[PDB]
């Protein structure tokens, strides 16, 4: 039974996520020509919802938080328009571009 939970929000024009095999494989589309495949480790599963939200659900806190940061590290938020993957409660502070 899962206890430790983490949520991620994806912001971007044409940026997409999809789970593949029982919540054990994660696939991502981040504007490249190819896609990004990550294998969710044991004790953690992944889920995708209809607000461009990715849920990391699991029983080991270390693996859950490490894998959530792993998914985040594929694309950090940019400072000029906030596009990328970020945490749900995380505030991204923008700046104007000359």
């Amino acid at each position: 039974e899962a206890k430790f939970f983490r949520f991620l929000k994806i912001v971007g024009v044409g940026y997409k996520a999809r789970a593949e095999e029982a919540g054990r494989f994660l696939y991502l589309k981040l504007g490249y020509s190819h896609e990004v495949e990550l294998a969710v480790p044991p004790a953690v599963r992944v889920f995708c919802f209809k607000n461009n939200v990715v849920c990391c659900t699991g029983i080991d806190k270390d693996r859950v938080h490490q894998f959530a940061a792993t998914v985040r590290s594929c694309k950090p938020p940019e400072v000029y328009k906030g596009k990328g993957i970020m945490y749900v409660d995380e505030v991204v502070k923008k700046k104007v571009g000359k």
Binding site: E1, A2, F5, H34, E35, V36, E37, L38, A39, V40, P41, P42, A43, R45, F47, F49, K50, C55, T57, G58, I59, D60, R63, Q66, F67, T70, C74
Partner: protein, 122 residues
């Protein structure tokens, strides 16, 4: 703080000296930043002279009632545990709306299994 509750019932004795936590929760729940966040949420204050101990009994949106020991636990600990249960309820509802079964079960043997590092792949 007031997003997840539907009805709160506070009950206490006014001449009994353990009302500090319950009136502090009254201060927490009757603020200006609270009632604008849920206009539909209801508060219920009851006072009595007899010796029923001070209690906080709350309900949530999804029909779950929770009673707390307002005599011996502080209002801030109450405020932390209501949100600790509330976010679990929200996660349950967010999973249930999308068609996933709740609760999700993971075999409790993969804690012993070795895991390599997750390197992103093309």
């Amino acid at each position: 703080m007031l997003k997840f509750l539907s009805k709160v019932k506070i009950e206490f004795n006014t001449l009994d000296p353990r009302l500090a936590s319950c009136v502090e929760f009254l201060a927490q729940c009757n603020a200006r930043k609270a009632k604008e966040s849920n206009p539909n949420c209801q508060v219920l204050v009851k006072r009595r002279t007899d010796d029923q101990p001070p209690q906080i009994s709350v309900t949530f949106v999804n029909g779950v009632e929770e009673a707390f020991d307002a005599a011996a636990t502080s209002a801030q600990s109450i405020r932390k545990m209501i949100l600790d249960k509330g976010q679990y309820l929200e996660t349950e509802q967010m999973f249930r709306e999308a068609g996933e079964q709740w609760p999700v079960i993971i075999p409790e043997e993969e804690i012993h299994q070795e895991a390599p590092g997750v390197k992103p792949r093309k």
